[PDB]
Design a protein around this ligand. Structure first.
Ligand SMILES: Nc1ncnc2c1ncn2[C@@H]1O[C@H](COP(=O)(O)O)[C@@H](O)[C@H]1O
Ligand SMILES: Nc1ncnc2c1ncn2[C@@H]1O[C@H](COP(=O)(O)O)[C@@H](O)[C@H]1O
Lengths: 143, 143
């Protein structure tokens, strides 16, 4: 009653049935923050895949990103793109944005902890969104 | 359609009616992580005030704390106290644990952003829990 159980750390996301793979809320690189704020408050999801003109994931926009925008001492309005969050961090280049179904729980957990991020986008071979894995999903696997 | 509106940044938490002040789920410094994990998965709250023998807040235990525990390369079981999370960070000493009803939205937002934390415990004059303010609560105020 090692924590975490080693037999479950060696299992893939697919095997453990971890994540959300239906009804994914997401936005574009051309999406203004007002759109994302409306989603967060009315639709009630914790983070949003940000996809480019090809449908490929280039960022994740979270509730903390909005608060960080709100603390900026320079003047902003809500017509700023969600891509201005990229001035504060690059999940993409740090390799802490995406994951695959075949990756192990141990791998996914290490990636989350690596940059202190609360979610990863599950993608396909073309970096197109298949689903999302958040700490809540991991916790259900850790029990 | 400065974001955030200055007239709302200068208002207190009390004035804006921001936070949860009823039915707060919390744990003790003597609480094992298995207890917190059960709360997170079954009760479905995002973070837990950690209070000492006097009922004073000494930490907040979050879902990320469990994942961080799970990534530790040393051997753990679930009978570790929630206070082992304190090896990774001290919200208390950094002044990013607590807040008051009379503090401004601007103050609260800056504190969140200061340590990249997603919540603060609202306390009284004796550091006893009155409520909790999370990014979701702030977002409802930012609209
Ligand atoms: N953008 C999203 N669209 C749909 N479901 C999501 C999204 N972001 C997170 N979820 C799911 O919401 C549930 C709760 O996650 P969390 O809000 O982090 O506790 C999890 O099962 C996530 O996979
Ligand atoms: N330990 C807790 N007990 C009760 N409510 C909480 C607790 N932690 C967070 N909340 C509330 O849960 C709601 C959603 O917060 P969050 O899960 O961060 O999106 C907010 O109104 C928080 O104040």
């Amino acid at each position: 009653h090692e924590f975490p159980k080693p037999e479950f750390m060696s299992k893939s996301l697919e095997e453990l049935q971890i994540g959300t793979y239906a009804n994914i809320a997401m936005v574009r690189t051309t999406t203004p923050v007002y759109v994302a704020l409306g989603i967060f408050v009315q639709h009630r999801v914790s983070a949003l895949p940000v996809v480019d003109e090809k449908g490929r994931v280039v960022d994740i926009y979270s509730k903390f990103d909005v608060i960080n925008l709100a603390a900026e001492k320079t003047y902003n309005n809500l017509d700023v793109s969600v891509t201005k969050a990229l001035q504060h961090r690059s999940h993409y280049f740090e390799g802490v944005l995406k994951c695959y179904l075949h990756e192990t729980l141990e791998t996914i957990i290490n990636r989350l902890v690596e940059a202190e991020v609360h979610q990863l986008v599950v993608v396909d071979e073309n970096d197109v969104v298949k689903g999302i894995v958040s700490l809540s999903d991991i916790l259900q696997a850790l029990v």
